[PDB]
Amino acid sequence: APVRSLNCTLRDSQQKSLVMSGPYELKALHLQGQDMEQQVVFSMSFVQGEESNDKIPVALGLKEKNLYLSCVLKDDKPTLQLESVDPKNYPKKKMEKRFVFNKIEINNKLEFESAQFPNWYISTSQAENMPVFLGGTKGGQDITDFTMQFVS
Ligand SMILES: Cc1ccc2c(c1)NC(=O)[C@@]2(c1cn[nH]c1)c1cc(-c2ccc(C(=O)O)cc2C(=O)O)ccc1O
């Protein structure tokens, strides 16, 4: 089955934009209007024909597909990383499981659950300029829902 890609930006439910913070990390903060160009453009890839399903596996690439968001164990704990890939072979028709998230649309917002680590989600802190991380709790102070804005 063929793969479809969309370019987009992500904002958490409290309107914090996502930006790079060096080569290995994303941070979330409320950006000023003139700094809006700092927000990361993602290439969200998924399999064509699943638009009506409740859970849609997605891969999130960035840097013109040079990096992908990846879920790996670090110190025996699910961790979000930015993994380097050869952009020529991406996105794959069969993406490696560590790059896959179930995109679930709840109350008009988006939630990204790790396919490799169930009940672990892409998360942000309430505080400004803190790293984007994989979190195991929902409903607490950590934010697990986002809105998406299409670039192309
Ligand atoms: C671009 C793109 C994204 C995502 C995928 C592809 C390409 N190609 C795929 O095959 C892909 C897919 C299958 N259906 N739709 C897309 C896929 C799905 C899973 C997956 C997701 C959720 C769960 C769960 O437990 O909820 C289990 C698994 C698993 O299969 O272990 C793992 C690897 C994988 O690559």
Numbering used by the authors: 1 to 152
Question: Which text from the study accompanies this structure?
Answer:
IL-1β is a key cytokine at the interface of innate and adaptive immunity. IL-1β is produced as a 269 amino acid precursor protein, which is cleaved by molecular platforms known as inflammasomes that assemble under pro-inflammatory conditions, leading to extracellular release of its C-terminal 153 amino acid-containing mature form. The binding of mature IL-1β to its cognate receptor IL-1R1 on nearby cells and subsequent formation of a ternary signaling complex with IL-1RAcP triggers a pro-inflammatory response with the production of inflammatory mediators, such as IL-64. hIL-1β belongs to a family of 11 cytokines that all share the same β-trefoil-fold structure despite divergent amino-acid sequences (IL-1α, IL-1Ra, IL-18, IL-33, IL-36α, IL-36β, IL-36γ, IL-36Ra, IL-37, IL-38).
The crystal structure of the hIL-1β/(S)-2 complex shows the binding of the ligand to a cryptic pocket formed upon displacement of loop β4–5 by up to 11 Å from its position in mature hIL-1β. The X-ray structure shows a short hydrogen bond formed between the main chain carbonyl oxygens of Lys93 and Met95 and the phenol hydroxyl (2.5 Å) and the indolinone lactam nitrogen (2.8 Å) of the ligand, respectively. These two polar interactions anchor the ligand in the cryptic pocket and are thus critical interactions between the ligand and the cytokine, as shown by the lack of binding of the methylated analogs 4 and 5. The indolinone moiety (ring A, ring B) binds deep into the hydrophobic core of the cryptic pocket facing the side chains of Val3, Val47, Pro57, Met95, and Val100. The pyrazole group engages in a hydrogen-bonded interaction with the side-chain of Glu50, which is part of the loop β4–5. The para benzoic acid group is H-bonded to Asn102 Nδ2 and makes water-mediated interactions with Lys55 Nζ, Lys97 Nζ, and the main chain carbonyl oxygen of Ala115. The ortho benzoic acid group is H-bonded to Lys97 Nζ and forms a long ionic interaction with Lys94 in one of the two complexes making up the asymmetric unit of the crystal. The binding of (S)-2 to hIL-1β did not perturb the conformation of residues at site A. In contrast, in the ligand-bound state, loop β4–5 adopts a conformation that is incompatible with the receptor-bound state of the cytokine at site B, which thus forms the structural basis for the antagonistic activity of (S)-2 and its analogs. Intriguingly, the minor form involves residues Val47, Gln48, Lys92, and Lys94, which are all critically involved in the formation of the binding site of compound (S)-2.
